[PDB]
C-alpha cells in the first residue's frame, strides 16, 4: 500500500499472508471461517503454500502466529487469465485456524448488497509502500 | 521499491464501473470493482488481500486486491474482484465441501 499507514496490531484479524514453503510472502488473503480463506485466482496458490494467520510484523520472531496447511485449492473456473475477470480462489485448510483476539473471520456480502460509489472502504496488506 | 515488515491500511473510496472506464476502458468487467485514485494505492504484494466496507456495524469483504497501475499511481484507481458477483460461487463451494 502506497501512502497508507501502519495498522493497529491485530486489528484486521482476517488478513493472512500466503507464503511459499521457503518463507517468501507473495499474496494476501482473508479468513471467512476457521476452515476457509478467500484470495485471488492469479496468485496461483498450491497445496505446498502456507497460510500465515495472526501476523502484524513479518520481521518479528515473537508474535503468536499460526502456520496453516492447505488441503485443497478451488480456483473459480470462470477465471479468465487474459481479462483477469472473476479473480477469486478459495483455500480449504487441512489445519483449521484457532480463532482468537488476532485471528477471526470477515463477513461475506449478499449477492444483492449495494456498496455505493463514493463509499469510504479500507484495504490492507504488506504490498510495497513505494514502487 | 520498499517492502514493509508491518501490516499497512489505507481508506479509499469506491468508484462506479462507468467512472472506472475513464481510467481503464473496456478492461473493466461486471465482476470487477474499482477503488482509490484518491492519493493511496494497492501495490505489488497486496494481491489476494481484502477491500472491506462497513455494513450494519460489521466489516464486509467487497473486493479482492487484483490489478492496476504498473507504478501503483495514487491518481489511478485499483481494480478489485467484486465479491457480490462471486459470492453465490463461494457459498456453493463451501456448501459442497
Amino acid at each position: 500500500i502506497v501512502n497508507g499507514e501502519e495498522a493497529v496490531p491485530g486489528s484486521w484479524p482476517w488478513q493472512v499472508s500466503l507464503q511459499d514453503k521457503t518463507g517468501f510472502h507473495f499474496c494476501g488473503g482473508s479468513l471467512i471461517n476457521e476452515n476457509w480463506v478467500v484470495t485471488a485466482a492469479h496468485c496461483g496458490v498450491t497445496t505446498s503454500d502456507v497460510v500465515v494467520a495472526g501476523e502484524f510484523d513479518q520481521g518479528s520472531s515473537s508474535e503468536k502466529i499460526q502456520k496453516l496447511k492447505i488441503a485443497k485449492v478451488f480456483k473459480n473456473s470462470k477465471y479468465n487469465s487474459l481479462t483477469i475477470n472473476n479473480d477469486i480462489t478459495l483455500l480449504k485448510l487441512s489445519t483449521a485456524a484457532s480463532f482468537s483476539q488476532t485471528v477471526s473471520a470477515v463477513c461475506l456480502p449478499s449477492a444483492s448488497d449495494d456498496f455505493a460509489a463514493g463509499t469510504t472502504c479500507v484495504t490492507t496488506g504488506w504490498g510495497l509502500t513505494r514502487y | 521499491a520498499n517492502t514493509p515488515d508491518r501490516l499497512q491500511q489505507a481508506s479509499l473510496p469506491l468508484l462506479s464501473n462507468t467512472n472506472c472506464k475513464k481510467y481503464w476502458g473496456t478492461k473493466i468487467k461486471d465482476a470487477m470493482i474499482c477503488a482509490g485514485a484518491s492519493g493511496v494505492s494497492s501495490c505489488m504484494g497486496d494481491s489476494g488481500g481484502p477491500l472491506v466496507c462497513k455494513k450494519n456495524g460489521a466489516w464486509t469483504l467487497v473486493g479482492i486486491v487484483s490489478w492496476g497501475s504498473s507504478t501503483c499511481s495514487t491518481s489511478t484507481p485499483g481494480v478489485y474482484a467484486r465479491v457480490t458477483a462471486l459470492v453465490n460461487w463461494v457459498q456453493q463451494t463451501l456448501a459442497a465441501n
Binding site: 499507514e5 495498522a7 493497529v8 496490531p9 491485530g10 486489528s11 484486521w12 484479524p13 471467512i32 482468537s100 483476539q101 488476532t102 477471526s104 473471520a105 470477515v106 463477513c107 461475506l108 479500507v122 | 491500511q9 481508506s11 472491506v52 455494513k55 456495524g57 460489521a58 466489516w59 464486509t60
Partner: peptide, 13 residues
C-alpha cells in the same frame, strides 16, 4: 464475523 476484538483505528476516521 467482521467485528475485530481489537478495533481498527484509521486516520481521519
Amino acid at each position: 464475523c467482521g467485528v475485530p476484538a481489537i478495533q481498527p483505528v484509521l486516520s481521519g476516521l
